[model samples]
Target: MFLAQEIIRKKRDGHALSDEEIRFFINGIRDNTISEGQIAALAMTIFFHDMTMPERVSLTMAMRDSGTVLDWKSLNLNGPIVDKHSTGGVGDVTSLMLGPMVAACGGYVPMISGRGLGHTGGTLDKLEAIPGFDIFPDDNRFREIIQDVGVAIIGQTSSLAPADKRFYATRDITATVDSIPLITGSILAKKLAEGLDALVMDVKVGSGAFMPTYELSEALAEAIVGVANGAGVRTTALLTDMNQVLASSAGNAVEVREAVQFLTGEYRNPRLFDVTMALCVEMLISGQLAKDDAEARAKLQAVLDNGKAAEVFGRMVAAQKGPSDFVENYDKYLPTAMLSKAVYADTEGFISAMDTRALGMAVVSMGGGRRQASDTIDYSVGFTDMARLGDSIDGQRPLAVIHAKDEASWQEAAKAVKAAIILDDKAPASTPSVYRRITE
Candidate 1:
């Protein structure tokens, strides 16, 4: 056993602590044996000295062990328990369909999602667009749905990684929030608590990205991969493009509608399809549902083509208390904006780039996301039929269709969207849906 201050001293002096030391310190954190000042000092030290991969792994594992870890073995599942995490992005609606696609291919998905934060929309909010969809199901119901439908997209349970609650709050105020080692531990502590056999992280890249730069995102990705695998979960990360909106629509009900259309094959945004497929491929391979990218793609494609993925999505919706025929009749249940109309570019030119972060804030201002913590979302208000990078915009071609609760809101969003996009004389070079994959 080690004293908290001694452990902090060793780390501050740039010495790598042993796993036992890391465990003892984290246990102290969990049991209130460590003072807030000690925790804050240790976090600040880690921010400067950083943690070695081994130390980061031990830290993540100890935090994970600080609270309840879901056990799927008791249910005798035949497939791997797998999940994905995204740093989040504007118009990133991958989770709505990913869970069902993987589940249909024989992986159990228990996705824990949060509300929109900063400029990005969230999965739980998108799912909540369904009139009766429940994101906070009872633990037993969550287990039952995961066992039966093979997927359950829900909110985090209180018992999961309770230690991170305190750790993150300390990091937030202590200016240590962005430390890669601490971030790795914080993100994985909660994820690993899901008892995942495998996980994939969608670390987005570009102007709308969480990390603000590609290199930082990549560093976080590598750190997460190292720490997670060392903590006994098979993990990988994809550097996905986020310079522009990833999906054609970006709002709660609108994005959910787009997801349903994607699953049912009504339409698939090529960019969204690519990112979603690439992430699912990683999940399948890591979860052992398929051995290679080729095999995994085939299985996933078959599920999507055969309606199995769509069926599973519907089942999950119903299981989560959404309409039973949601997939087939999504239009009936999903809300619509009071005013839905297109906004045109003032001048005609090839689409160049987007200030995706600014565009997301426009949605927030329209009430698709919260401005105040107590504010409710207007699920139907956001862009749809969105034009992409390199597309031409003229009298006939518009930037995006803005959905809003009123004319004033629509007018404000229209001006914001127009200001967010940069038009050029010619087209901009195209970007890849996925930049690269990182693995341990």
Candidate 2:
């Protein structure tokens, strides 16, 4: 008999688990046969001893197999199914553009997105800001959209990677959530449920990152690349910046407006452009659509410049029940805040430092994000025209333009903004939008 405690003891003694043992443990986790204490104990051992490459792959694939694994072969699509994921962030809005751009460049993207919980923004919430945009399409519609427009960004439903569901709940309560092997299994379990041929990770770093340090981010990225590849999917990761908002806006409707604008070439934040292009390039390269970086960049640039990427975005939106003319008429359909005002620093100086987490919390306080599970977001309220690091702070150059439902909330956000940003006499050194890429 394969006892749970025996398996836990084997791992605690610094031994690799057999594939059969990993499957049995995961099945017990999914079916409620394993107790929470036993689960926590096993996780603690994993955190302490770590897992080998084969063991990590076994764990990821076990959790992945515990729930629904989407069958894409039945659809008979022509392109590789590729997707991108990020460790959530404040103003990270890459998913809104990545899916369409990749699809336009001959990749099929079946993206599943999430909602804002705390300091981080969610792709599902941003997409929901558009009046008729639907993020929960049925299976038939989802497959049809993927087949027709070559992309679909929808919400995560029940029964996808259910084993990780239990494991994560236990890990969250047991102080065992930060381990690389556990985190790797949790993240890849859900992404692999999509039956992807290739995936790219946008692992954010700096002040607003999920992982506490750059080293942890790199380690997590490397582990994810390794485990996902070991599970037979071509994967890579990029260490991207999150010291400031990735986009100029941070909120639901405002970010959606910015996404439409970026796609249509109305306005492009240079930092945002650099990061988005890099992630899409990885998807193309891993999916075998491009031979190298130069070619991948060329295809992505052509789509953006020739309006093909923007057109695909419009098509995806319309196919998912949003207005057919959304790209051209976004302003008319999306919500607008009642009060739009600029908040300035208390004293004139260069922005030397930003409490980026505090800035995200400021947006949460404005009701642009959620504080509780049931909180209904006031999508119209958030920050826009955001000032960046190393920028001048003066009466002439306000910190950021605040959008709120009323003057009272607007004033509150202004106070929070002033408190979160630090001004100094001299400019700080700038950091690259993207630090490095991880391919294995």
Candidate 3:
């Protein structure tokens, strides 16, 4: 019988937490026996001292089992159940395409997604941009959608990892959300609760990412891989670049439009495609749907090229109550801003770098993202046709196009874009989509 205060004191003083103590604490999280203050205190303690890989794994599994941990074995689905989780970033609508792409390649993706509350984009928020899209469905409907459509992008239900929900709420307000161990447990617990056969994590690095640097991002990648593998699930993580906005567009309805274009081959951002395909290949190979990287690429390309993936995306959206014709008619269905303006460069030079986080915050300022947990998002407000690093720009060619609701918002956003993008006489060297891959 471990006392919550004793556990808090042990972690606060830098003592390693036992699996039993971690499990007991998580149990308290689920059963309402742990007060909010106690959870916040222990979370803050772990935020400073961190937790061992074993402790993280125990905490993850305990929280996963604290609710209705799903079992897909009885469903007798033909494909391997797999999913990917990003540590959140700007213009990261990859899940909008990645899920259906995997499904088209013979994998079932039961993705439990989240909403935006900071600079990073959220999957559920992006999906909610479509009219009639149901991000939350009952368990029976969720299961049916996955079985029928091969993928279902939805929010975390009350039945899935309720313990993580409580703990994360405490972490959110206490400013203790950056702890590596806490992030690993929070992310994997939700994925593991889906009865996943394999998982891939995209841990972003650089200015736009949550971790903001290679070292911290790599540490998070390793923690996720180690803890997930330790818990008897095959998992891998990629330390992907976030020095720039992921897609050429960033905002809710606009990003969803970007994804539809990406799927239909109307437009494709090279860096975005690189990252998305890399993750899809990893997931396909992990699920044993493809023999190797070569075969996986061929398989995913066939789906994307032949419109199979796009069609699957349509079906998935329709199954979840989004428009049945969304893939083709996204422009008609998505919201549009009242004012659109180009943000031009002041001088002639090649784009060198970006303070990507500032650009994301700019969108938040324009009502494209959330500043607080209760803030509402304006789906039509964001940047589009954004110039990339190394791209030449001048007074004639703008850095990006700003879509806003009024003159004031557009002026503010344009200033933000000008300040965020750095220019010089020469183009900077390019960086790869993936820096490294972590595996167990």
Each model's backbone clash number: 0, 0, 0
Q: RMSD in angstroms, all models?
A: 1.5, 1.2, 2.4
After superposing candidate 3 on the true structure, give the runs of residues whose Cα lies further than 4 Å from its correct spot.
1-18, 35-52, 165-178
Model 2 lDDT at residue 313:
93
Q: How accurate is candidate 1 locally (lDDT)?
A: 0.90
Worst 10 residues of 2 by lDDT: 112-121
TM per model? 0.97, 0.98, 0.92
Give residue 249's error in model 1 in angstroms: 0.6
Query: In model 3, what is the error at residue 391, expressed in angstroms?
Result: 1.0
Q: For residues 160-260, write the lDDT of model 1, one tens digit per residue.
A: 77788778888889898989888888878878889999999999999888788888999889988988888889999999999999999888899999998
User: Candidates' lDDT values, in order?
Assistant: 0.90, 0.90, 0.88
- Residue 13 in candidate 2, Cα distance off native in Å: 2.5
Expressed as tens digits, the lDDT of each residue in 1-440 for candidate 2 is: 33499999999999999999999999999998988899999999999999999999999999999998899998788789999989977777888888889999999999976555777878888888888888999988999999999998898656788888789999999999989999999988988999999999999999788887999899889999999999999999999999888899899899988887888889888999999999999999999999999999999989989999999999999999999999888999999999999998889999887787788888888888888988888888888898999998899999999999898989999999999888999889999999889986
Which ten contiguous residues of candidate 3 have the minimum total lDDT? 113-122
lDDT of 2 at 236: 98
Name the regions of candidate 1 deviating beyond 4 angstroms: 1-3
What is the C-alpha local distance difference test score of candidate 2?
A: 0.90
Model 1 per-residue lDDT at 84: 96
TM-score of 1: 0.97
